[PDB]
């Protein structure tokens, strides 16, 4: 939460998910059925469906319920090189996180960053691996 | 005939004079560049501290 609201400083993205706790505090029935209408359309929406199932049969369920579903753009958001250091000396563990501008759902660099992501990869203090793992990060830590 | 006598005794005891004030005006003009430069780094680098805010949030 910390690292999008210092990373994203200045726009939505730098706001949580739940909201501040003065706006579930106050926030009206009014406040929540305007933003249902203004957000919840049908071409912002998508019906998913997976198993055992004709498409078709979904399409037509489609028709019978989601008919009456109605029919806001997002600024691009200002990344900020940006530090945000809540020193708190009474947790035992620090947690630490750390990221550049990455490059958004789109574009295609995505994979080549995720098959270097991969190299580096993740590790714990329950894994198998140790000081014979692939990654020099984790092996090295 | 004081003049240039004197002209003269100041070489005497000073040969270096002209080339001392010709890098004096090299060293001044480098000062010039240099310090405004490195001040800007200085406060480039500092730019992180300058900036920056605390706020105290006891439980």
């Given at each position: 939460n910390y690292l999008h609201a210092?990373?994203?400083q200045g726009t939505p993205l730098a706001q949580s998910v739940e909201g501040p706790s003065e706006n579930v505090r106050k926030l009206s029935r009014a406040d929540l059925t305007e933003y249902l209408s203004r957000h919840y359309k049908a071409p912002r929406m998508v019906l998913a469906a997976?198993?055992?199932?004709?498409?078709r049969q979904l399409l037509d369920l489609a028709q019978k319920h989601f008919s009456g579903l109605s029919g806001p753009t997002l600024s691009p958001c200002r990344f900020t090189g940006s530090q945000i250091c809540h020193r708190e000396d009474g947790?035992?563990?620090?947690?630490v996180a750390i990221a550049?501008?990455?490059p958004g759902w789109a574009h295609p660099d995505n994979v080549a960053l995720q098959v270097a992501n991969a190299i580096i990869g993740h590790y714990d203090c329950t894994y198998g691996g140790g000081a014979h793992l692939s990654s020099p990060l984790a092996s090295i830590a | 005939?004081?003049?240039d006598v004197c002209t003269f005794l100041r070489w005497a005891a000073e040969p270096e004079h002209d080339h001392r004030k010709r890098m004096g005006l090299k060293m001044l003009l480098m000062m010039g560049l240099?310090?405004?430069l490195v001040y800007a780094m200085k406060r480039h680098k500092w730019?992180?501290?300058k900036s920056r805010k605390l706020a105290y949030r006891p439980p």
């Open positions: 210092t990373a994203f997976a198993g055992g199932l004709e498409h947790l035992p563990l620090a947690h550049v501008e990455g | 005939v004081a003049k240099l310090l405004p730019s992180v501290l």
